[PDB]
């Protein structure tokens, strides 16, 4: 299934839409601070964002900002974050 859920993407779409999305995209400028609020170092956000940046253009759309939301919340009370975008968390629009 999708590493993310419907109830988790729901809170992700509130954080993504809390920065003001553009045509369906958030710029690292809105996510960076969103990831810096998790009390995590830039090493987790540098990895939570990359595996979250499906387009890798310095932005995180609703679907990209979602992959980086659990990657941030699960990095605090779950486990560490690797740098390998898992196939159970990637949208079929990137392939």
């Amino acid at each position: 299934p999708w590493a993310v859920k419907p109830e988790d993407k729901a809170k992700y779409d509130a954080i993504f839409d809390s920065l003001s999305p553009v045509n369906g995209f958030l710029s690292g400028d809105k996510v960076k601070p969103v990831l810096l609020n998790s009390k995590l170092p830039v090493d987790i956000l540098g990895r939570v964002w990359e595996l979250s940046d499906i387009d890798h253009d310095g932005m995180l759309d609703r679907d990209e900002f979602a992959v980086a939301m659990f990657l941030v919340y699960c990095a605090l009370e779950k486990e560490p974050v690797p740098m390998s975008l898992p196939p159970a968390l990637v949208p079929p629009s990137k392939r």
Partner: peptide, 6 residues
């Protein structure tokens, strides 16, 4: 230009 933490 793509990661705000790199």
């Amino acid at each position: 230009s793509t990661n705000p933490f790199l």
